[PDB]
């Protein structure tokens, strides 16, 4: 009878916290670091789309939940995570720091500042994946947003809360028109009229740290680096970062939209984010789908864009103007993503 007790006592040893302390309920252990997605064991109390900590500074999101293991997508280079490494949950859904303190600041796809200008004062933490407003909170777009382009203001006008596409081949403007819009917002952003002020946000998926650096420098030169927020998803950064950055900026703009303010968001090169999510999908062994893209890429872009809308007077009369950018091949609108 005492021999089983001694066996149990020695069995609880040499195994660490797998079944002795914390029982891998809040904590866990990596089973196998996959291609970009680490098969993680444990995390019994984790929930879907929950931010996780890999003990090496690498964040993770729970897309793959199985009765035995939980697959965690890596927010960063997979080198920093090892098989069997200690992994613990953050205890919350994938969240983004939001508020007016991000004005004049550039962040990554997870809200972490990258300009080295100190921590960010965040009013709150909005979830990355937020359901779009329903039929009633939305209101027909009636307020104008002036981009500064004669061919865009006078013709094909954009209003606050509208989701207007920018289509270009390689270098035919695209982000340029977004820049003239951003700089034209300075005319009212210096004023005291909150209704006419437009707190813009920018998305930089698939772009270079150098291109975003020059972009921030140009914005600062024109005094636009005061009401504009830039989320940077560099091509060097992992594909999950490029996936998350548009939702990061969507939450950033939705903060202004819900609080009665008006915001504009430029999903610059959403095609690059589409290829990033494609990479993520066939790293999940997901079906190649239609023309190499997963069947839910449309769902991705749709749930991303629907968050931008003009709220009614009951919901503070806020708005979120979307300016997605699609990089096409040979000026083709008949491709899947366009």
């Amino acid at each position: 009878k005492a021999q089983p007790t001694e066996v149990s006592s020695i069995l609880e040893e040499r195994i660490k916290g797998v079944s002795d302390e914390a029982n891998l309920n809040e904590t866990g252990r990596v089973l196998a670091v996959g291609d970009g997605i680490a098969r993680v064991f444990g995390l019994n109390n984790i929930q879907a789309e929950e931010l996780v900590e890999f003990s090496s500074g690498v964040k993770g999101m729970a897309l793959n939940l199985e009765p035995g293991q939980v697959g965690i997508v890596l927010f960063g280079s997979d080198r920093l995570v090892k098989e069997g490494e200690l992994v613990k949950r953050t205890g919350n859904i994938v969240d983004v720091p939001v508020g007016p303190g991000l004005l004049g600041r550039v962040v990554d796809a997870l809200g972490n500042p990258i300009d080295g200008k100190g921590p960010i004062d965040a009013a709150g933490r909005s979830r990355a994946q937020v359901k779009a407003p329903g039929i009633l909170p939305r209101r027909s777009v009636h307020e104008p947003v002036q981009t500064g382009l004669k061919a865009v203001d006078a013709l094909v006008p954009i209003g606050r809360g509208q989701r207007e596409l920018i289509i270009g081949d390689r270098q035919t403007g695209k982000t340029a028109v977004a820049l003239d819009t951003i700089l034209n917002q300075k005319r009212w952003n210096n004023g005291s009229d909150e209704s006419k002020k437009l707190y813009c946000v920018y998305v930089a998926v698939g772009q270079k740290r150098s291109t975003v650096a020059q972009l921030v420098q140009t914005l600062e030169q024109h005094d636009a680096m005061k009401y504009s927020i830039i989320v940077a998803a560099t091509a060097s950064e992992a594909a999950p970062l490029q996936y998350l950055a548009p939702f990061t900026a969507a939450s950033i703009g939705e903060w202004f939209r819900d609080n009665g303010k008006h915001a504009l968001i430029v999903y610059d090169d959403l095609s690059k984010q589409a290829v990033a999510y494609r990479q993520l999908s066939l790293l999940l062994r997901r079906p190649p789908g239609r023309e190499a893209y997963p069947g839910d890429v449309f769902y991705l872009h749709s749930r991303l864009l629907e968050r931008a809308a003009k709220l009614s007077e009951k919901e503070g009369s806020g708005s979120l103007t979307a300016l997605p950018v699609i990089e096409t091949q040979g000026g083709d609108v008949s491709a899947y993503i366009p």
């Binding site: 291609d35 080198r79 995570v81 190649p288 040979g330």
Partner: protein, 355 residues
């Protein structure tokens, strides 16, 4: 300390699976050492397969490998010799000098896998690189820290153009250039080495202005996909220590793309394109984001680009063209007839050609 050891479990062509003990599992992209009778073969770690087994990509041929053979962990990624000692030397993917000129007595050896400079360290304003060539820095000015695309070929003086760029960058500035030949043909590479020996670009008895860290085609997939990173790390050291306007040459960036496809689309992953890797944009970003302008120096990439089937919309040329700054077209016929430097004045465009 005690060296980390492992055993070979699977050898699927260029793919080698190694099993380690608990808590001894190396991180991915690390270098694993095995002693082979033919030479010094090492394995770069790919995705972990679980059960304390890691999938690895062979940096050299896999002939002669025995299941259960001892595998030594280097404790980090592949480390290449770096510094002025590497100038004028020929380096393969694994850092060994294959020019049989002796060991590279470099005081530092940086890993080929390094995180690109942060957003703060990026240059705020784009700068023009003075290449000393009239046709080049007037119509397609070279971006300081940019990724210039050389659209030449054979018989258009691509080699002499590269040598002239090396000489000009080493004369006007420090310009300790580095030539990285992804998937070299071991005949074009030998010819190029002979020409730089003939010219002042490579000077064995004295000082040289370039390092020929290139990889031959007969190397397995991944070797061509990491020679770019080796030369990239050499240029990174040159930029971050000497503060020089380093100039980096890729013999064929599309060859790097296809090598990355073979290692990371057909050796464990699923293709997402015409046949290239699903991570094509991702590893392109990893390679060419470390090529930029920092506070100390700036590495400029002049990468020859090949267009499959002359398809500009091809996703690999689409990714490469998604960031090329300025492009140089050494056209066949229309420019080399007469003008010796070639460089087609019309098709050579630049993103910095603005006031």
């Amino acid at each position: 300390s005690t060296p980390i050891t492992g055993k070979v479990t699977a050898v699927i062509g260029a793919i080698v699976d190694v099993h380690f003990e608990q808590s001894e599992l190396p991180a991915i992209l690390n270098a694993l050492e095995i002693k082979t009778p033919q030479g010094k073969l090492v394995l770069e770690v790919a995705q972990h397969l679980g059960e304390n087994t890691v999938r690895t990509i062979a940096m050299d041929g896999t002939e002669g490998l025995v299941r259960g053979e001892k595998v030594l962990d280097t404790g980090g990624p592949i480390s290449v010799p770096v510094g002025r000692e590497t100038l004028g030397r020929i380096i393969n993917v694994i850092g060994e000098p294959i020019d049989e000129r002796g060991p590279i007595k470099s005081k530092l050896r940086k890993p080929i896998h390094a995180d690109p400079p942060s957003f703060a360290e990026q240059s705020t304003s784009a700068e023009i690189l003075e290449t000393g060539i009239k046709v080049v820095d007037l119509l397609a000015p070279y971006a300081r820290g940019g990724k210039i695309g050389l659209f030449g070929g054979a018989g258009v003086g691509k080699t002499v153009f590269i040598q002239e760029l090396i000489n000009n960058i080493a004369k006007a500035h420090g310009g300790f250039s580095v030539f990285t030949g992804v998937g070299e043909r071991t005949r074009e590479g030998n010819d190029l080495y002979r020409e730089m020996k003939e010219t002042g670009v490579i000077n064995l008895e004295g000082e040289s202005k370039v390092a020929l860290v290139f990889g031959q085609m007969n190397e397995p997939p991944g070797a061509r996909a990491r020679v770019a990173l080796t030369g990239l790390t050499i240029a990174e050291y040159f930029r971050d220590e000497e503060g020089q306007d380093v100039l980096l040459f890729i013999d064929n960036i599309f060859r790097f793309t296809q090598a990355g496809s073979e290692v990371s689309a057909l050796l464990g992953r699923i293709p997402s394109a015409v046949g290239y890797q699903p991570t094509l944009a991702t590893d392109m970003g990893l390679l060419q984001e470390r090529i930029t302008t920092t506070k100390k120096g700036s590495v400029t990439s002049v990468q020859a680009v090949y267009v499959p089937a002359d398809d500009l919309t091809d996703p690999a040329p689409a990714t490469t063209f998604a960031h090329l700054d300025a492009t140089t077209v050494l056209s066949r016929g229309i420019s080399e007839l007469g003008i010796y430097p070639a460089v087609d004045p019309l098709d050579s465009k630049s993103r910095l050609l603005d006031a």
